[PDB]
Amino acid sequence: LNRLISQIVSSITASLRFDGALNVDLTEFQTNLVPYPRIHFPLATYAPVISAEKAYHEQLSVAEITNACFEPANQMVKCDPRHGKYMACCLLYRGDVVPKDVNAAIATIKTKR
Amino acid sequence: PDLKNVKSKIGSTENLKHQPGGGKVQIINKKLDLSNVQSKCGSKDNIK
């Protein structure tokens, strides 16, 4: 549990430990995740979240991993976020990630309104 | 227990006076005055 928690915080601070295409500071978070100052506590997700046996039976694109982030079973807080209404989702990438397919993929989620 | 009164803090409940209100636009057009104008060649009266 403490090693998966680590991979979440590593990924949140990737943008300030190494260089990138779109570089999000820890001060930027409040301005996009907090719509009112006490409505300030977002739930966590990370993905892919698979073992070495599985990697070789699924497509691992920016499209696929961004689409899986929304699945209600694979949230790091045990609630069905369908019960409620999203206010702002902050999405944060790492690796072989071309911005055009970040734009496509996040567009597709909204397109599933 | 009893809570007597409690309310939300702070959003759309504190906005209900300020719309905001709109405005009005206008053209952006004129004329010119032609009342001074005569032709600058002028021989045909020389028939006199």
DSSP A40-105: --PPP--S----TTTGGGS--SHHHHHHHTT-GGG-SSSS-GGGS----------SS--HHHHHHH
Range of the domain at A83: 43-113
Q: How many angstroms separate the CA of residue A87 from the nearest CA in chain B?
A: 14
Instruction: Please indicate if any CB of chain B lies within 8 Å of the CB of A36.
Output: yes
Report how this structure was experimentally obtained: cryo-EM
Contact state of A38 with B11 under an 8 Å Cβ cutoff? no
Residues of A whose CB is below 8 A from B11: 36
**C-alpha distance from residue A107 to each of A28, A58, A63, A82, B13 (Å):** 21, 22, 10, 19, 32
- Closest by CA position to A47, among listed A16, A87, A81, A92: A92
Chain centre to alpha carbon of residue A112: 17
Return all residues near A40 (Cβ < 8 A) that are at least 6 apart.
A30, A33, A34
For B11, the closest chain A residue by CA position comes to A36
Structure tokens at B21: 């209100």
Return all residues near A60 (Cβ < 8 A) that are at least 6 apart.
A48
Helix runs in B1-48, H state only = none
**C-alpha distance from residue A11 to each of A65, A94, A111, B3 (Å):** 14, 7, 26, 43
Instruction: Please indicate if any CB of chain B lies within 8 Å of the CB of A34.
Output: no
Q: Which of B7, B10, B14 to mutate to test the interface with A (most CBs of A within 10 A)?
A: B10
Residue A90 near residue A33 (C-beta atoms within 8 A): yes
CA distance A82 to B17: 33
CA distance A38 to B9: 9
Q: What is the dihedral of CA A73, A75, A81, A87, to 10 degrees?
A: -150
**C-alpha distance from residue B42 to each of A48, A113, B12, B38, B47 (Å):** 92, 78, 76, 10, 11
Q: What is the CATH number of the domain that holds A110?
A: 3.30.1330.20
Is A22 labelled a binding residue? no
Structure tokens at A100: 């055009």
Q: How many angstroms separate the CA of residue B10 from the nearest CA in chain A?
A: 7
Q: Which amino acid is at A68?
A: A
A53 is catalytic: no
Q: Is B28 left (phi over 0), alpha (psi -120 to 50) or beta?
A: left
Residue A47 near residue A65 (C-beta atoms within 8 A): yes
Residue A106 near residue A76 (C-beta atoms within 8 A): no
User: Which DSSP helix (H) or strand (E) runs through A108?
Assistant: helix A99-111
Residue reference for tokens 């046996």: A53
For B8, the closest chain A residue by CA position comes to A38
What percent of the residues of chain A are helix, what percent strand, and what percent coil, each to the nearest 5?
40, 0, 60
Return all residues near A29 (Cβ < 8 A) that are at least 6 apart.
A90
Resolution in angstroms, to 1 decimal, for this deposition? Answer: 4.1
